[PDB]
Design a protein around this ligand. Structure first.
Ligand SMILES: C/C=C(/C)C(=O)O[C@H]1C(C)=C2[C@H]([C@@H]1OC(=O)CCCCCCC)[C@@](C)(OC(C)=O)C[C@H](OC(=O)CCCCCCCCCCCNC(=O)OC(C)(C)C)[C@@]1(O)[C@H]2OC(=O)[C@@]1(C)O
Ligand SMILES: Nc1ncnc2c1ncn2[C@@H]1O[C@H](COP(=O)(O)OP(=O)(O)CP(=O)(O)O)[C@@H](O)[C@H]1O
Ligand SMILES: [Mg+2]
Ligand SMILES: [Mg+2]
Ligand code: NA
Length: 994
């Protein structure tokens, strides 16, 4: 293992003590592999169904439901009557429901994958090495490779392990570092070391990254690191090292169950306590034993009456409808419980280029020297038309079209472009557009030249597959591109060494054409071409050139700038070391300025807008880029991140500056900064760490393996649709169109969803509260069971579901994206609201209980002790001649329970309307504000009726109610609720808030 890419080539061969000629002797292997182990990323930990199922039974609510289903199952085996056979339908369903979870929770998980499981997709199976047990190449297995032994790589290989390169057999070595680094092109490699120990992957040019692919060539190397120590391994760790939290909804889950479990217990405490007399009045008579079976069968009744059985399924049902919904709007939510979190994103750190700007290069201005006298300068500035790389546009100065050949300065600037360019242009018939063959910034140049055909060369008598490069290729036949000095991140420029063909361009042997950042190339210029002549680059001449440079890249224009020059007297060919990039800055001096070229990477429309929405939304937007600060900034104001004129010094730091600042200011910077320029790897995460130190839900967006470590830890990681599998499987959402805006649009559904989601949740809960109250009373008073678990379930599952899940469509507020993103800590039911549902429930609890008992104490179709002596219904067959000479079996009558169970049903089909709104009266928001909710209610009612009329059913529950006698009685109980709410709902006006 060597963090050395900065070491000499022999220095490594030294460290490992290995023969670049022989390799590692089988001993070295046995010893190296035991200090280094195998080159491979650790396997996964997959739980068994056993383990899975067990989690499915680790919720307090699922358990409280399992203990209850036991007591029911246990009771349903204590009667000895032929009629009491439907005894196994209660403890049967409960299980069934609890079973349907485990079932779903497992398949739920079984289909989800690990972001890391996606990484191992980058590990090659075989490798190619050289060791002491053979002269010819040995082809082994990635993992059997050890830090040290000599490995060789070829054009068609995937790089196993991180290799410090020893020697390049090919004439050149190309690499696709795409997946785990900055920008991919055929990145070249060289053998000489890299001085800086703290070098960024891209800058370690003598290296072979594990997983990356060698595009072209065949070179030899010595393995630096193996395994998890390998550059990517270094990542896999990050990801595995991170743990993410439960959506502030799931958070609230445990919370509610924790309590819903405390309460419950307490009841049984109050309950057992109201029947304490049974300790100082019993005559040891025997009817005892049948009194314990009461508490036991009333306790499991208490459970299916405290837990919102059906809720779980209504929520996810609400979410999946929304997934598909956003999917239409190009947004892809990976895992849904995350929609909530998206709904309250505090900040969005998105990259610029790919998403914000369209990334469509096009030269808009050029500028070449026109004349220099004493101190008087004179430039020739231009304008170029054409968004597309498409070779279609016109060159104009002072808005007047202009032939290009008419000016020398241009004819050179033009060639330079065409020659110091590795890109080109290609046209396709499948879509009919002109596509970016190489790198955009280059493919745009190639384009520029096309538009200003310096040679007035007929191109309209040529097809469109030929128009693509007619003007370039011509300038290409005007020089012999001997070789090229690739771009390097320190001289921030590149150059092409050329020769002319024997007769035409003989004038001056070889010359050199360079292009890069104006700062550099310009200093390196000691002269300046004025048409066909040169002059001593002077003080004034320079300022004036940089002044326009700064004008373009800082002005509203927000243009990118390329300074073009040529080295007239290039060093002799054989005196150049075309293969040791260090010296490339030396070969690029004594330069003659030729002119700079400005081009734009236009922001995508809706962004400006989408940026504004965030404002009203209060959602912060941080722009992570690769532009220089001066340009990042501008660009921002151009979109709205900043407002032209705004002071931005503190709100925008740079890749470096940031690293400088101490952990102290690091944090600060982050809560206010909105523009990070020249960002590096770690940053995307350190920030996401500070943005978290401010309890801020923050969005992050990357595209490749290197971005994963953050995308993971970000509350909401957003991966590009044109991004790499891994990253995607790391983010919690994916953008097919990459449009930043799609993020904001997604942040919208995110709130909406949760608002309906939210309410429909409050609806089914309060009801569950009510139910509880019913059993409490049914129990505290002795009164016969008023409602049965087997019932309560049906309700909380169906008669309650269809209105709840229809509520999920409640018309979205108009002010959504006009209120700061929601708080996570904000509880679902509190304050006066608590008081409200605390009352509605206390209402239904009695409305139901009293209902069943009514049919017992006033209804004609079943007279009962009007003195309330039904309370002791427990004792009837006993003291048969006590106070009743009645048919003792009437207490277990169906009519009384269908009474309450129908006043419940209705009260909810009603309460499910004092919901369409929280405080806006129904006359201010009639139920017909939602077509679904109404319809749904009907489907439930024809249903509830299904359990009265369809013979198989009623016998399971209770028999039919006498229409207009008993039903009417039902209505004179429930309907009033609405009032009770409209009344609390009115207590709105009687307080400030609204
Ligand atoms: C429910 C029924 C009852 C009886 C209950 O105990 O509720 C209390 C309680 C706990 C509360 C409240 C409630 O307090 C009372 O009513 C006092 C008890 C008096 C009644 C007893 C008679 C003597 C709450 C409900 O009501 C009011 C109006 O006071 C409101 C609120 O609740 C919310 O905001 C809910 C949002 C939680 C988040 C929703 C998550 C649950 C949804 C999933 C359902 C899982 N169930 C299930 O069966 O799944 C399977 C797989 C099948 C097992 C919450 O104050 C909560 O405490 C909290 O921490 C909160 C923030 O939570
Ligand atoms: N095709 C090209 N050839 C030579 N130099 C180029 C170039 N395109 C840009 N440059 C110059 O080289 C410097 C760096 O190029 P770099 O590869 O970092 O650009 P980039 O801006 O395309 C990254 P990002 O796309 O993430 O914003 C630029 O700041 C510019 O001055
Ligand atoms: Mg570039
Ligand atoms: Mg990137
Ligand atoms: Na996460």
């Amino acid at each position: 293992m060597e963090a050395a890419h900065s070491k000499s080539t022999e220095e490594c061969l030294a460290y490992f003590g290995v023969s670049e000629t022989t390799g590692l002797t089988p001993d070295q292997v046995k010893r190296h592999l035991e200090k280094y182990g195998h080159n491979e990323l650790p396997a996964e930990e997959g739980k068994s169904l056993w383990e899975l199922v067990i989690e499915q039974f680790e919720d307090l609510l699922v358990r409280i439901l399992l203990l209850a289903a036991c007591i029911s199952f246990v009771l349903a085996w204590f009667e000895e009557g032929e009629e009491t056979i439907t005894a196994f339908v209660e403890p049967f369903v409960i299980l069934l429901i609890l079973i349907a979870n485990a079932i779903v929770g497992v398949w739920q998980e079984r289909n989800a994958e690990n972001a890391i499981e996606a990484l191992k997709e980058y590990e090659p199976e075989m490798g190619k090495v050289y060791r002491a047990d053979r002269k010819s190449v040995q082809r082994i297995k990635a993992r059997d490779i050890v830090p040290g032994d000599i490995v060789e790589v070829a054009v068609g290989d995937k790089v196993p392990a991180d290799i410090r390169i020893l020697s390049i057999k090919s004439t050149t070595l190309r690499v696709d570092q795409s997946i785990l680094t900055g920008e991919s092109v055929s990145v070249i490699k060289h053998t000489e070391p890299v001085p800086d120990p703290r070098a960024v992957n891209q800058d370690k040019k003598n290296m072979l990254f594990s997983g990356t692919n060698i595009a072209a060539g065949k070179a030899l190397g010595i393995v630096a690191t193996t395994g998890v120590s390998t550059e990517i391994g270094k990542i896999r760790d990050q990801m595995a090292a991170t743990e993410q939290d439960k959506t502030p909804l799931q958070q609230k889950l445990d919370e509610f169950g924790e309590q819903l479990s405390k309460v419950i217990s307490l009841i049984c405490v109050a309950v057992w306590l109201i029947n304490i007399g049974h300790f100082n009045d019993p005559v040891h008579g025997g009817s005892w034993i049948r009194g314990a079976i009461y508490y036991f069968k009333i306790a499991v009744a208490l459970a299916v009456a405290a837990i919102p059985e059906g809720l779980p399924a209504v929520i996810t049902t609400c979410l999946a409808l929304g997934t598909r919904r956003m999917a239409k709007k190009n947004a892809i939510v990976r895992s849904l419980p995350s929609v909530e979190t998206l709904g309250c994103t505090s900040v969005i750190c998105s990259d610029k280029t790919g998403t914000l700007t369209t990334n469509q290069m096009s030269v808009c201005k050029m500028f070449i020297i026109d004349k220099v006298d004493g101190d008087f300068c004179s430039l020739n500035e231009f304008s170029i038309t054409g968004s597309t790389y498409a070779p279609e546009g016109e060159v104009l100065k002072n808005d007047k079209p202009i032939r290009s050949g008419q000016f020398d300065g241009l004819v050179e600037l033009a060639t330079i472009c065409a020659l110091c360019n590795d890109s080109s242009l290609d046209f396709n018939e499948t879509k009919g557009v002109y596509e970016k063959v190489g790198e955009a910034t280059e493919t745009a140049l190639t384009t520029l030249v096309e538009k200003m055909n310096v040679f007035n060369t007929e191109v309209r008598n040529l097809s469109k597959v030929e128009r693509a490069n007619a003007c370039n290729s011509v300038i290409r036949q005007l020089m012999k591109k001997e070789f090229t000095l690739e771009f390097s991140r320190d001289r921030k420029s590149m150059s092409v060494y050329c020769s002319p063909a024997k007769s035409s361009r003989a004038a001056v042997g070889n010359k050199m054409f360079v292009k890069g950042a104006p700062e550099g190339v310009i200093d390196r210029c000691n002269y300046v071409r004025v048409g066909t002549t040169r002059v001593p680059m002077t003080g004034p001449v320079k300022e004036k050139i940089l002044s326009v440079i700064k004008e373009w890249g800082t002005g509203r224009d927000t243009l990118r700038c390329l300074a073009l020059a040529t080295r007239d007297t290039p060093p002799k060919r054989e005196e150049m070391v075309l293969d040791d990039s260090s010296r490339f800055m030396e070969y690029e001096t004594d330069l003659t300025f030729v002119g700079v070229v400005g081009m734009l990477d236009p922001p995508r429309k809706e962004v400006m807008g989408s940026i504004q929405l965030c404002r009203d939304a209060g959602i912060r937007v941080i722009m992570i880029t690769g532009d220089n600060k001066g340009t990042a900034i501008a660009i921002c104001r151009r979109i709205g991140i900043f407002g032209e004129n705004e002071e931005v010094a503190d709100r925008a730091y740079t890749g470096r500056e940031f690293d400088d600042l101490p952990l102290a200011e690091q944090r600060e910077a982050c809560r206010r900064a909105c523009c990070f320029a020249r960002v590096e790897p770690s940053h995307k995460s350190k920030i996401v760490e500070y943005l978290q130190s401010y309890d801020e839900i923050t969005a992050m967006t990357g595209d490749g393996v290197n971005d994963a470590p953050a995308l993971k830890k970000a509350e909401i990681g957003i991966a590009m649709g044109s991004g790499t599998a891994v990253a995607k499987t790391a983010s919690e959402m994916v953008l097919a169109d990459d449009n930043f805006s799609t993020i904001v649009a997604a942040v919208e559904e995110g709130r909406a969803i949760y608002n309906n989601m939210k309410q429909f949740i409050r609806y089914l809960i309060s009801s569950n509260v009510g139910e509880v109250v019913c059993i409490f009373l049914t129990a505290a008073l002795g009164l016969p069971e008023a409602l049965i678990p087997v019932q309560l379930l049906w309700v909380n599952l169906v008669t309650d579901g269809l209105p709840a899940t229809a509520l999920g469509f409640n018309p979205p507020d108009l002010d959504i994206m006009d209120r700061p993103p929601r708080s996570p800590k904000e509880p679902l039911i509190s304050g006066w609201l608590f008081f409200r549902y605390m009352a509605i429930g206390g209402y239904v609890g009695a409305a139901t209980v009293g209902a069943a008992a009514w049919w017992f104490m006033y209804a004609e179709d079943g007279p009962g002790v009007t003195y309330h002596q039904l309370t002791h219904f427990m004792q009837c067959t006993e003291d048969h001649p006590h106070f009743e000479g009645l048919d003792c079996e009437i207490f277990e009558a169906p009519e009384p329970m269908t009474m309450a169970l129908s006043v419940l049903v209705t009260i909810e089909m009603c309460n499910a309307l004092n919901s369409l709104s929280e405080n806006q009266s129904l006359m201010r928001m009639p139920p017909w504000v939602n077509i679904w909710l109404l319809g749904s209610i009907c489907l439930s009612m024809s249903l509830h009726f299904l359990i009265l009329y369809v013979d198989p059913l009623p016998m399971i529950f209770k028999l039919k109610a006498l229409d207009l006698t008993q039903w009417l009685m039902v209505l004179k109980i429930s309907l009033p609720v609405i009032g009770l709410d409209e009344i609390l709902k009115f207590i709105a006006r009687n307080y400030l808030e609204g």
